Design a protein around this ligand. Structure first.
Ligand SMILES: [Ca+2]
Length: 579
DNA sequence: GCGATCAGCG
DNA sequence: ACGCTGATCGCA
């Protein structure tokens, strides 16, 4: 029901200088994944190509790599990365429908071309799921069925660029797509393909040391409990703590006794088993997720792990990292921080370089709220967390511990993002009136923050959405719900999303500007990871001194706010040493 | 599959 | 009853 040429060879008219292009990779994780078909739509027609002959034809490969041949796509990173694993370069992508849909409305959950096409009442295309199936029934269909799906996806992209660009323009989101998210998409593709080298000897070692330590605390738990049970079973553990040992019940969940670490922490005066259970879980988490989990996904030939940075998932514009998640590698406790010693440079005589923004969201907030005292604090390069730790624990700066700072840090963000006296009282372990008094006092010093929280909630009611500094948008329909709980959650999104989303916008512009600077200085240094406000590179050790002056500067100059941006940086033989 | 839990980001 | 995530695992 849609005409196309099912072609056996490439022909000149498939190589127009503007085209819609589908390079279909069905596997969720596209690293080293099969390309199952190709589709091209342009002014001359609609063409399906088998990847065997199209990716071995030199004129088509040259066309893919030619930045003056403009391609419209959906999820161009997925194609770019799977082609890099075939040794082929994709350039010249000028429209990515996925990033366009994500900017217009992140809550859509746009997972394929059909979902995006629905936003514009376009439905001559099927959902990817209706064509490939789900779970164990997933399959590439017969070639005539596959080719019409890929052609229909390309025809949709061909038709939907224009209405998507015009609504982005009306939203002021068009330079955000073309100058931020699409260039970033090429950079993430490079980072994902490059990968991070892992020392599997050091990892496999730590695991054996953990298996020993697990059993020791495991046996001390069974002895302290006076019996053995399934320590990971909330059923049995609940029975042990709150029925056998008859510990106080401080919280329930929808299924029973809560055993979350905040609970166990408040039970430590009552019994010694609770602290051992905490130690057990911690060691189990390192064993399950970071030792075993990491070793699963290392490619054994190269010893590299290849994350996937999801660019159209978070409702604020942050990235997320999947399989492995490289944005939540342990750092806080010393035992878990050692996992970062396994993250090593990919060549000999190279180093890891890490640079990160200091309190990026409070600096964004100070700029957006224009709060006099908060701006003055950052113009003095104050460390708000340490100052807040002093005011909390009535200690002096010399006697503020990283433990004390971590708590003060959660107080600083919590207050500006709407924590209640109740929640603050439970975090500090202080009275509910003291918590409320602490909060009202905090807003005495920063009344501009308070006005901002009120104004942005009112502006979300009137407009229906909040925006960030580079015009990312999040719709908040629940801001007017009559249900109190639902409306509250939406008001706290209004306070948080513009701030966190603007921090994401800043780091994303930093990565683009940093890649340009690296190129024109002709350094081999390249990006490996982004961790929300932190950039990790690897580079030949003789580039380190230059990078110490280049990366801080590029990050500090990404945007210009009414307070300075502060960047801290380290380098070393491993990711662990780069702090 | 879901949700409680915990690792990270602020 | 601060916000944004992803992985693991028991399932009450
Ligand atoms: Ca930081």
């Amino acid at each position: 029901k849609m005409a196309f040429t099912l072609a056996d060879r490439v022909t000149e008219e498939m190589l127009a200088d503007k085209a819609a292009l589908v390079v279909e990779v069905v596997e969720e994780n596209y690293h080293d994944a099969p390309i199952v078909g190709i589709a091209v739509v342009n002014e001359h027609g609609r063409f399906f190509l088998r990847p065997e002959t199209a990716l071995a034809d030199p004129q088509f490969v040259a066309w893919l790599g030619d930045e003056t041949k403009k391609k419209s796509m959906f999820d161009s990173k997925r194609a770019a990365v799977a082609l890099k694993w075939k040794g082929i370069e994709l350039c010249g992508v000028s429209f990515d429908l996925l990033l366009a849909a994500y900017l217009l409305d992140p809550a859509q959950g746009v997972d394929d071309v059909a979902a995006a096409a629905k936003m514009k009442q376009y439905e001559a295309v099927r959902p990817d799921e209706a064509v490939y199936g789900k779970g164990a029934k997933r399959a590439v269909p017969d070639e005539p069925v596959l080719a019409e799906h890929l052609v229909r996806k390309a025809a949709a992209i061909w038709e939907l660029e224009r209405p998507f660009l015009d609504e982005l323009r009306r939203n002021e989101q068009d330079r955000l797509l073309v100058e931020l998210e699409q260039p970033l998409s090429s950079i993430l593709a490079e980072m994902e393909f490059a990968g991070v080298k892992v020392d599997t000897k050091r990892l496999e070692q730590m695991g054996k040391e953990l298996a020993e330590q697990l059993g020791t605390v495991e046996q001390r738990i069974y002895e302290l409990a006076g019996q053995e049970f399934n320590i990971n079973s909330p059923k049995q553990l609940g029975v042990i703590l709150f029925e056998k040992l008859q510990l106080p019940v401080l919280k329930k969940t929808k299924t029973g006794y809560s055993t979350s670490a905040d609970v166990l922490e408040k039970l430590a005066p009552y019994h010694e088993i609770v602290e051992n259970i905490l130690h057990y879980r911690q060691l189990g988490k390192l064993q399950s997720t970071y030792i075993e989990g990491l070793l699963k996904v290392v490619r054994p030939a190269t010893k590299k792990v290849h994350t996937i940075f999801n660019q159209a998932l978070t409702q604020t514009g942050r990235l997320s990292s999947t399989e492995p998640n490289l944005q939540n590698i342990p750092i806080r406790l010393e035992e878990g921080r050692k996992i970062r010693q396994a993250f090593v440079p990919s060549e000999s005589d190279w180093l890891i370089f890490a640079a990160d923004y200091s309190q990026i969201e409070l600096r964004v907030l100070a700029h957006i709220a224009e709060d006099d005292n908060l701006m003055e604090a950052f113009r003095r390069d104050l460390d708000i967390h340490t100052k807040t730790a002093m005011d909390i624990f009535q200690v002096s700066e010399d006697e503020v511990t990283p433990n004390m700072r971590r708590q003060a840090k959660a107080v600083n963000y919590g207050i500006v993002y709407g924590i209640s006296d109740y929640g603050l009282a439970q975090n500090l372990n202080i009275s509910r009136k003291e918590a409320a008094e602490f909060i009202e006092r905090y807003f005495e010093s920063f009344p501009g923050v308070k006005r901002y929280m009120e104004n942005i909630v009112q502006e979300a009611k009137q407009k229906g959405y909040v925006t960030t500094l580079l015009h990312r948008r999040r719709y908040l329909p629940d801001i007017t719900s009559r249900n109190f709980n639902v409306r509250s959650f939406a008001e706290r999104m209004a306070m948080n999303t513009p701030i966190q989303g603007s921090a994401a916008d800043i780091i994303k512009k930093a990565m683009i500007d940093l890649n340009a600077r690296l190129k024109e200085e002709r350094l081999q240094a390249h990006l490996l990871l982004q961790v929300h406000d932190e950039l990790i590179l690897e580079a030949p050790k003789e580039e380190m001194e230059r990078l110490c002056r280049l990366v801080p500067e590029v990050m500090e100059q990404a945007v210009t706010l009414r307070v300075p941006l502060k960047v801290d940086y380290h380098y070393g033989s491993t990711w662990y040493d780069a702090k």
